[PDB]
Write a protein that binds this DNA or RNA. Structure first.
Lengths: 214, 116, 130, 86, 76, 197, 142, 25, 93
RNA sequence: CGCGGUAAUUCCAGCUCCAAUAGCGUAUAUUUAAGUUGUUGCAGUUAAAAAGCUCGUAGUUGGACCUUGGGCCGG
RNA sequence: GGGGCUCGAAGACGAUCAGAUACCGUCCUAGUCUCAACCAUAAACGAUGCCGACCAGGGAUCGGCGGAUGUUGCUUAUAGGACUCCGCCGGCACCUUAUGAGAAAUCAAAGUCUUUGGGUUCCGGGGGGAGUAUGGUCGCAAGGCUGAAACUUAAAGGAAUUGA
RNA sequence: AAAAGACUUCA
């Protein structure tokens, strides 16, 4: 079943929220995956990579598995789950849950010209994990996703159709490489345009609007 | 050695005391009977262990509050103390007796005040 | 050196601080950057203090931020004078992607990227406004 | 508070003009001064630079006036002075 | 935010701070919204507020209190 | 800087009586040479290596602070916190006066964070007696999107706790006086309150 | 730390740049003239004549006789060893025939596992090595 | 600057092995 | 390696002080890296105190203590005296 | 990089499959990748890497006042 | 040359050691010391170029200066000076956070280089070979300085983390 | 504290 635990879960499931846009605005911390499932049942999973971990441990080796799963729509929503567990299947299951928590929206935009319908990125944006620099780079439309297999997949969830990408740093470190691509897309809401410079009134927190119902 | 209380004993000992307290006593023998009423423990030695530990705790309670044991009677005592509230034991006597800095502020706030 | 870069660098680190200015000494190619900021409204006011008797010239800035969003997201230098790296009206390398402008000292004087481009006159980039 | 610069920049405290060097100042001036130093032996009072440097004597009376030191002059024995100059 | 062909485009106009200056991201769950009501005599006088936000970043920098204090005045 | 606007409720204005309690309680006693950049509140450095705090400036902060508390319709959602025995006295009596829930003694991590945990709290405001000792609860609240108001001394961190009130977290009657006054002010607007003191 | 940006100072950057290239393998090959030091002239293939069939043992955890043959280039005096790949082929090579050899794809250097074997055999007796093992074609008499 | 004991050993051997051809034995 | 704000070890605009030699081994050590320890201690003992003063002229004397700073080569201090190891935060003491 | 020490998806044949397709392999040179040549576009605390130090040239680089600033109409 | 007290490569002795040529013990020459001369190298280090501006709080201490009808001083009285102070130039550095950099350890610089271009210079540009070979240069000598390639080979190396 | 040295391949 559903069943919402927590005030945060009560707000969303009981139809007091209609959109995930609201959740992002008031910076509500998702930690139960069920919350995002009710508003968005259209989320698609995709197990990206399984990679072995090994320990030598106090009484026998105890070998774990990293599991990378990206859950998202194909419309501005990427979500990143990484779990380490002794069983492959358990790590995958947990990663699906984690990915749903960590869903964060991605600005699609235009370059120079306001074109028709956002399909690119508004600005040049970079994401760093370890030493690897990954760059969102302006591209004319119809270029396709100019990337290796795995960075294409991440940008499909983002809904971005056209960018050049380039990376430098250790590309050979599979674990880190997947992590680095995510950060760029979330950091889109970190770059100044005059378009988003425009001042908004401030919407009111659900914590004060729905005191009685909680 | 040997005779240390376990976790299972620690949880049970507090609980029995808390909601049986008037009936409970310092006396070992009667509190053995109480554990028959309150629980089924399968072997003989378990009953004796719990009964002994609880009575030792009962002595401590009636000589000072115990860290993880709160009773109806002890809670009432705490409440009575924390119903009193004047200013919260500041008085000083009428008008305060400041020592510059605030003297300059109080003068240009229309408050006379004593100094010292 | 030539100041210029120092102003730009100081500006962005001071934005992270959330200060209402930093105030510093200024020169004549760093008179230019401030007036260009006013036009594209990163500043809605600037004041050039003590430029009259003193050893130097200076200007305390009153600067946009302490609002909601920062207006100047990044300004970072792209080479001072004493160098040959050069652009023309057709050569145009850029930052941003048209949200910002590329600061250019042209033949007539300092003007923004679009003004210089229309007139069809090249020049040398001073910095990159994003 | 959040201050880099002051809430009233134009009038800072004197202690914050003792911060920044003489060259660096918002309104630069000599922090040094001229003063008239007073001597019983002479009828008139002699105008003197604050940082004496040389062991200045009063013009008519051979009384002395001050002795020099690393900063502003260290006046010697019983003498009086007002701080003024035109 | 317009398009070439009419339509207002690019949904989700985000939150964006006040005391801190920088966009409030979705990732930044640490960030907070402070509503201080305008008041009449003996009244909360709700439905009138000065609304402010505070980033997670400033809440680690230590400048969080300082920046809020400047803006906290009811009308400016 | 300082806030002005609105209409004063009644008792929210300054009284000679109100200042008398605060100065008697020794709220205005600041710590020694250490003193943060945030502190405008010293004016003239007082003898024997200590600074006393301008209580007229403090009054503005307290008056303003009350406005923020009551602006949520339901009063119980604010939780107060104090490990300290001096502030425990303040916390419990505050909770009695107002809607406010109390958490006395040890905080325990995973109260503010860890939503899955039973002890999950959502509070609209938090009042802490001393953010210096209660530094670990500040961290959880910061992540948890819970604002933390605290009565702070200058060597206590006004850093990263919004709305700082210069105080005397060292002990004595000072902490109890601050909460007592705060409770009186918040009840003044649309509460149980009566005129007078 | 940072590179000189300056109107005249261009010269400093240019002069240093050339030296760096020598670390890189491709430029080093031309600049030092290491290609000449390697047994080939620079040629696509080179031809030699079979001195001997030699049975070179594999290195380290691999154990096996690789079975090679040493050829002396027609162009040079240089004797070098070339590998004969595939089942048989030690029989198909033979002493004193003309063998056409090419590199491994190692771009000079010994392969690693076979010590000192710098080349491999492309064809023997003009036929094609590939054809002979496969039994597609048969060696001509003489 | 000067590195490690590799250069220390080889410094001693640098002129010794040049002179060990005049000596031979 | 670098875990230390202290740089190499006790080098603040100096590099080299002026050498003391260990009491134990006589290895050169600059003064700040030496390890000095105050051993201000009685000649007698606990028990011995009593015996001497009984069989001596003057009330107690004063007892004329022995004062020595003890110089170590680092290694020497580890084997008995004050080094022992630590926990990471208290090392900045 | 690795495999083959007798049930080798890495060999050798067959089968089947993949995949370019009148074209495909292989070698050498060369460009990209390689920001491994750093103009665009590098690194030097600890990974390759600040000269022991200072003076100091050829060489590069180098502050400000500087007939400039302002005002009016026309289109 | 003076000078050789002390200590002390090599050697020579005792244990230990299959060997022990060493640690360790004992003898002790050059030398250590000084002067006029050579020499040119060091983990000659902050393993961190020089210079300039900026970005962050706080307390010491070193130096000078300023302000106190402060203390001690008693200087005839004072000024000074030592002490306590606050302000301050320029320091050696620490402390705590680090906005930010970094691979991390860490770091108010290793920040202000992906926000990629402040001025100038030097150096590196896989590991070994090899810092040698060779030539030039220099040194009294030792040997230094300058400084390859053949050929080999897939990692050398760093920081942190988990085992043993 | 001085009595403590060696130790095959795939791995």
């Amino acid at each position: 079943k559903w069943v919402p635990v927590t005030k945060l879960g009560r707000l969303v499931k009981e139809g007091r929220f209609s959109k995930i846009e609201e959740i992002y605005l008031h910076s509500l911390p998702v930690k139960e995956h069920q919350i995002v499932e009710t508003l968005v049942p259209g989320l698609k999973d995709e197990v990206m990579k399984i990679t072995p971990v090994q320990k030598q441990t106090r009484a026998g080796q105890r070998t774990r598995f990293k599991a990378f799963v990206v859950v998202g729509d194909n419309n501005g929503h990427v979500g990143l789950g990484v779990k380490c567990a002794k069983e492959v299947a358990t790590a995958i299951r947990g990663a699906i849950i984690l990915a749903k928590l960590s869903v964060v929206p991605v600005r699609r935009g235009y370059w120079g010209n306001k074109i028709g319908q956002p399909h690119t990125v508004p600005c040049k944006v970079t994401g760093k994990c370890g030493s690897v620099t990954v760059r969102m780079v302006p591209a004319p439309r119809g270029s396709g996703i100019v990337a290796a297999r795995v960075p294409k997949k991440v940008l499909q969830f983002a809904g971005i159709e056209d960018v050049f990408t380039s990376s430098r740093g250790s590309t050979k470190t599979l674990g880190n490489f997947v992590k680095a691509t995510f950060d760029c897309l979330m950091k889109t809401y970190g770059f100044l345009t005059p378009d988003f410079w425009r001042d908004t009134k401030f919407v009111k927190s659900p914590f004060q609007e729905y005191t009685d119902l909680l | 050695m040997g005779r240390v209380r376990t976790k299972t004993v620690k949880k049970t000992s507090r609980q029995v005391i808390e909601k049986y307290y008037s009936r409970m006593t310092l006396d070992f023998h009667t509190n053995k009977k109480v554990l028959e009423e309150v629980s089924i423990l399968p072997s003989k030695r378990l009953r004796n262990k719990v009964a002994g530990f609880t009575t030792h705790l009962m002595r401590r309670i009636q000589r000072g509050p115990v860290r993880g044991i709160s009773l109806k009677l002890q809670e009432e005592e705490r409440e009575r103390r924390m119903d009193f509230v004047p200013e919260k034991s500041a008085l000083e006597v009428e008008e305060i007796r400041v020592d510059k800095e605030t003297m300059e502020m109080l003068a240009a706030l229309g408050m006379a005040d004593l100094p010292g | 050196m030539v100041r210029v870069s120092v102003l730009n660098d100081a500006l962005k680190t001071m934005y992270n601080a959330e200060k209402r200015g930093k105030r510093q000494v200024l020169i004549r190619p760093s008179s230019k950057v401030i007036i260009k900021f006013l036009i594209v409204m990163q500043k809605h006011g600037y004041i050039g203090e003590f430029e009259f008797v003193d050893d130097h010239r200076s200007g305390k800035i009153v600067v946009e931020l302490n609002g909601r969003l920062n207006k100047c997201g990044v300004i970072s230098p792209r080479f001072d004078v004493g160098v040959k790296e050069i652009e023309s009206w057709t050569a145009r390398l850029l930052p941003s992607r048209q949200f910002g402008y590329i600061v250019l000292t042209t033949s007539a004087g300092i003007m923004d990227h679009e003004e210089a481009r229309r007139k069809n006159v090249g020049g040398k980039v001073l910095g990159f406004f994003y | 508070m959040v201050l880099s610069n002051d809430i009233d920049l134009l009038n800072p405290p004197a202690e914050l003009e003792k911060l920044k060097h003489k060259k660096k100042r918002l309104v630069q001036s000599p922090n040094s001064f001229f003063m008239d130093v007073k001597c019983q032996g002479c009828f008139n009072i002699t105008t003197v630079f604050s940082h004496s440097q040389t062991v200045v004597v009063c013009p008519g009376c051979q009384t002395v006036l001050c002795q020099p030191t690393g900063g502003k002059a260290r006046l010697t024995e019983g003498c009086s002075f007002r701080r003024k100059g035109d | 935010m317009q398009n070439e062909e009419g339509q207002m485009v690019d949904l989700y106009v985000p939150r964006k701070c006040s005391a801190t200056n920088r966009i409030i991201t979705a990732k930044d769950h640490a960030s907070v919204q402070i509503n201080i009501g305008h008041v009449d005599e003996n009244g909360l006088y709700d439905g009138r507020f000065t609304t402010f936000a505070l980033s997670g970043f400033i809440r680690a920098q230590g400048d969080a209190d300082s920046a809020l204090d400047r803006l906290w005045q009811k009308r400016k | 800087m300082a806030a002005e606007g609105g209409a004063a409720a009644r008792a929210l204005s300054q009284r000679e009586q109100d200042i008398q309690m605060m100065l008697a309680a020794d709220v205005h006693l600041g710590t020694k040479n250490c003193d943060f950049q945030m502190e405008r509140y010293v004016y003239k450095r007082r003898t024997d290596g200590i600074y006393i705090i301008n209580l007229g400036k403090t009054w503005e902060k307290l008056q303003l602070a009350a406005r923020v508390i009551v602006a949520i319709e339901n009063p119980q959602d604010i939780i107060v916190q104090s490990a300290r025995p001096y502030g425990q006295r303040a916390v419990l009596k505050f909770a009695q006066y107002t809607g406010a829930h109390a958490i006395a003694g040890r905080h325990t991590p995973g109260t503010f964070t860890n939503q899955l945990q039973t002890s999950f709290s959502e509070p609209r405001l938090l009042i802490l007696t001393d953010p210096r000792t209660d530094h670990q609860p500040i961290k959880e609240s910061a992540l948890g999107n819970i604002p933390t108001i605290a009565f702070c001394d200058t060597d206590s961190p006004m850093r990263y706790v919004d709305i700082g009130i210069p105080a005397n977290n060292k002990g004595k009657q000072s902490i109890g006086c601050l909460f007592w006054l705060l409770a009186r002010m918040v009840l003044q607007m649309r509460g149980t309150i009566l005129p007078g003191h | 730390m940072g590179k000189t940006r300056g109107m005249g100072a261009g010269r400093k950057l240019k002069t240093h740049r050339r030296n760096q290239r020598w670390a890189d393998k491709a430029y080093k090959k031309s600049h030092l003239g290491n290609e000449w030091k390697k047994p080939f002239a620079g040629s696509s293939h080179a031809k030699g004549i079979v001195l001997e069939k030699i049975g070179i043992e594999a290195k380290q955890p691999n154990s096996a006789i690789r079975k090679c043959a040493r050829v002396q280039l027609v162009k040079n005096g240089k004797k070098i060893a070339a590998f004969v790949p595939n089942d048989g082929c030690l029989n198909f090579i033979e002493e004193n025939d003309e063998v056409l050899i090419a590199g491994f794809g190692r771009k000079g250097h010994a392969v690693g596992d076979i010590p000192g074997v710098r080349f491999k055999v492309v064809k023997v007796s003009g036929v094609s090595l590939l054809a002979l093992f496969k039994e597609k074609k048969e060696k001509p008499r003489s | 600057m000067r590195a490690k004991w590799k250069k220390k050993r080889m410094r001693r051997l640098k002129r010794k092995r040049r002179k060990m051809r005049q000596r031979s034995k | 390696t670098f875990k230390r704000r202290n740089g190499g070890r006790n080098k603040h605009g100096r590099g080299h002080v002026k050498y003391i030699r260990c009491s134990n081994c006589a290895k050169c050590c600059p003064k700040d890296k030496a390890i000095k320890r105050f051993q201000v201690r009685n000649i007698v003992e606990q028990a011995a105190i009593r015996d001497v003063q009984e069989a001596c002229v003057h009330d107690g004397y004063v007892l004329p203590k022995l004062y020595a700073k003890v110089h170590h080569c680092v290694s020497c201090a580890i084997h008995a005296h004050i080094v022992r190891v630590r926990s990471r935060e208290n090392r900045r003491d």
